[PDB]
Subunit: 165 residues, 4 copies
């Protein structure tokens, strides 16, 4: 186990892009790889620790593969919702992503409103995350905060979800 | 199409300098390469994402090519005048350039006053944007701001342009 | 002598992890390597300067070896305690670690209470260093300060131990 | 000429360390190399622009050669004092050096008080400038400012030397 997740993380980015472009295009390999990450104790938090430390373009290429293959995004965020603490590990890496990555994540959700709402329901069903999530937004810089407001109200129903919390 | 721009972006910097140098040394290749970026849906925002995430020295070498080869700078900021989200996307990635890169970009424009004024007109001829440009001065470190001030005061005309708004 | 520590620092990170994964799995090599670093004049400062500048995953992985091999963690902070000024250089690089590394370091100590208290003793034992540790903990992002309190409060004894100082 | 400084800057760090460890051990090569940088129009500001963007350990290893070969440090701060902008191109990169590098630079001068005095006089002999040095130390982290004050207290003569301006 452990040597695989470091071997992956220390490949050159082109090989990691190729590895993920194989994996999340084949549901039969995706499903069982996330079984491997939960069969070894805590190993899903070692895969996510390695993930958030990647070159930021590989992180956006990964979220671009999931959001555009949404038959696997709802399942992926079911693993991190079922496993306690992993949702808090997500947000406390999301706050630290270099801001182009936060912008591309935000675009990818507001441009696919089903996958925004489904993600936003998991922040209720993993308990107590919303006060931290509101604080993440509140600690962003004034440029990103202004731009996210101007971007979000391109769909005022998602503005209402953001007001409902 | 898109995998070419990833392949390009993941090359070692010397290959990208060599590619961008051979590209903009040939106006007949420059024009059509941007037609390829503009005809594929949305793809120019994916090339520009890959640009702002480059090694900082390749970003200055690229601007150092255009401004000192300016018969292609006049065309380049025409493409970003055409596409209404792209000028917003430029400034809100400019603010996230390294302070040494912002300093060198400002030197590069103020030392070529025609190409300063042309860029400054595009901020008015594109919708909105100009209040982002002002705040993206005002949000910088006090040392950077004093330096960029003591730089621009060399030209009372370019001082008049920035102070007219 | 000095060339070994630069050659090591400039190897690709997999070779460094291989080198450390051998070294602190062999106590007969561990004690010899650190004796060479204490004996050559100032070389223990040059190994630690090269350590805090590493790729953040090699830094996490190194602490992940020591804390789980505590028969060597005991010795390691004995060497720094027997080299006055090194405990200053420790904290004054810890404050500059990437937040994901500080978070994992804290996690590794509170999940191994003996090795938290052992570390905490040397903050008294190196003359007056404790005040710099308290001050550094006050100088972190406000959501990370609350996250470290929420994490530490999982053990009320160690929660008491940081409050009784 | 100009392409040499990019070919150099894009070599792997071991080659740059080798190239510099050859150069500032041979005064006959050192004076010639900087004469080329002085003669080609603006090229010394292109070398310094490439220098301050280096991997931070190469920046320290370079100053660690000069200060310990001070018979070449005296000449080096003729060049950067003679071009009237170049001293500002030091300080407006020095404020942007990573904090561990600024600490190791400061330590390296405080351990050689005559080379500290030599550098400090060149700030006054280059036009104006000294108020930027006072501002730079006032803008560092509170931990760094406190630590540099306690580090400089190791030499009361240099405490007087920084107080007398």
């Amino acid at each position: 186990m452990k040597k695989e997740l470091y071997e992956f993380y220390f490949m050159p980015p082109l090989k990691q892009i190729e590895f993920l472009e194989e994996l999340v295009n084949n549901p039969e390999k995706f499903k069982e790889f996330f079984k491997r990450l939960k069969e070894e104790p805590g190993a899903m938090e070692l895969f996510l620790r390695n993930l958030y430390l990647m070159h930021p373009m590989v992180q956006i290429y990964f979220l671009e593969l999931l959001v555009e293959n949404p038959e696997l995004f709802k399942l992926f965020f079911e693993y991190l919702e079922e496993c306690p603490g992993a949702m808090e590990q997500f947000l406390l890496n999301l706050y630290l992503l270099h801001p182009m990555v936060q912008i591309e994540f935000l675009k990818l959700l507001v441009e696919n409103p089903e996958l925004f709402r489904l993600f936003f329901e998991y922040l209720k069903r993993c308990p107590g995350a919303l006060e931290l999530f509101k604080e993440i937004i509140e600690l962003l810089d004034p440029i990103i905060q202004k731009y996210l407001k101007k971007l979000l109200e391109e769909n005022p129903e998602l503005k209402a979800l953001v007001k409902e919390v």
